[PDB]
Structure 1
Amino acid sequence: SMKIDVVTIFPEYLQPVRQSLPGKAIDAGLVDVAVHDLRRWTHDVHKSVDDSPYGGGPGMVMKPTVWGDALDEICTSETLLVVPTPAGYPFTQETAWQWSTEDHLVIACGRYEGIDQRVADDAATRMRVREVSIGDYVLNGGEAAALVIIEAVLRLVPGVLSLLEGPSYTRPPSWRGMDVPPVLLSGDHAKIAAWRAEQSRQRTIERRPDLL
């Protein structure tokens, strides 16, 4: 049973998540994903969420006072506060597994140059905070990271949603002049397993030598 709150200035971007949630899991009370517009917590008529960076430089920084109020309302001491950032610790499958048993994730999605660092630093004095990155590329903000994190985590919650895997095949046995490897149709399941292991080994060497 997990609650996920996502805070973002683009709530419509989190649409694919609510599109991916089965009725059975929601109705059984296994999962609830709520998305919140950060501007609900702005102080001014212009609904300002950003301001110039101290020390200069390009772009804008998200205001701590707005985020502070949002997190004050949404988080409790039991919350796991997840902050996507390109400077984060790596989000991996081990992370997803660890987080899959949490009662409450709050995902704070930044835009512009990111969120004033005091927001996470203050939050970390009263709850668990995790700054993470989903990979070594640059996005426009945290929303796409949130989509990935939510999917990777929730698919590990029963009933909610190393070597590389080698090639897979299904019908038809011959297609555009390419036959399924005969070993797969041999009924020699020890040989099939060894063939698959070697395919996995080869693929890992070629594509992900960093894993060996």
Structure 2
Amino acid sequence: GSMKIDVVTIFPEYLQPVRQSLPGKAIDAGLVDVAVHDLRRWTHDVHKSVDDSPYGGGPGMVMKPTVWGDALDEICTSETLLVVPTPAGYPFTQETAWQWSTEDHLVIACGRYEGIDQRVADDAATRMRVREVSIGDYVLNGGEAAALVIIEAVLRLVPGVLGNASLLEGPSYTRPPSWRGMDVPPVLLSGDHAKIAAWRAEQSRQRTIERRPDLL
């Protein structure tokens, strides 16, 4: 019913859409609080360094464990579920979203560059629950867009937070009944509601075969 989400990122402005997506009613009811933190608050040096070269060589850079360690020490508690987006993560699915929707405290650690030194998650996992997850089979530049997806998918399952109320869903239609030469399937206007449900089931079967045969 109530959840705190802390997001840590070197691009705090990226997370502005979700703070805007929150209805005042939910905030006022104390049902939800989303806070965004600039990782550079926890840097050690005048240059506010968050990255360094990879051990073993290779392209790109790795985010520093000492900076992240300090950030997570301050923000996390023993009750925290630490969420770490990564293209190498376990798949984030609707099952995940449902599970996380009843958590009291999510912390989302958004990486950039080539990711975060693995000891950050490994150390954190010795005192809290840690979940390395991926939102899909494509590569992003960092975790912020993944955080937006995760926050939306989770919070829409928490009663009253975002203001909203297997096989693939089939097509939907509304007025007008005819538009640019295309008519709404007459069965939908038939008043035969058992037949409509059967029609929708077959549309779902066809669409699932065409687009996601793996689900069958």
TM over 0.5: yes
State the identity as a percent. Answer: 100
Pairwise CA distance, 1:26 = 0.3
SS in 1 for 2:187: helix
Q: SS at 1:203's partner residue?
A: helix
Cα deviation for residue 36 of structure 1 reads 0.1
d(CA) in 1 for partners of 2:202 and 2:176? 24
Q: Aligned partners of 1:181, 1:15: CA distance in 2, in Å? A: 41
Aligned pairs for 1:51-62 (under 5 A) are 51-62=52-63
| Correspondence for 1:25 | 26
Query: For the residues of structure 2 that align with 1:19 and 1:143, how far apart are their CA atoms?
Result: 16
Structure 2 length as normaliser, TM-score?
A: 0.98
1:22-50 Cα deviation digits (max 9, x unpaired): 00000000000000000000000000000
Match runs of 1:28-67 below 5 Å: 28-67=29-68
Q: Distance in 2 between matches of 1:15 and 1:136?
A: 25
Give the match for residue 143 of structure 1.
Answer: 144
> What are the Cα deviations for residues 101-122 of structure 1, in whole angstroms up to 9, with x where unaligned?
0000000000000000000000
Helix, strand or coil: the match of 1:199? helix
Deviation at 1:19, TM superposition (A): 1.3
Task: Compute the displacement of 1:97 (Å).
Answer: 0.1
Specify the alignment match of 1:178 in structure 2: 182
TM-score, normalised by the number of residues in structure 1: 1.00
Shift of residue 126, structure 1, vs aligned partner: 0.2
User: Cα RMSD (Å) of the superposition?
Assistant: 0.3
User: How many pairs align?
Assistant: 212
Residue by residue over 1:138-176, the C-alpha shift from the partner in whole angstroms, topping out at 9 and shown as x without a partner, is 000000000000000000000000000000000000000
Alpha-carbon distance, 1:189 to partner: 0.2
Deviation >2 Å, runs of 4+: none
SS of the aligned residue for 2:33 comes to strand
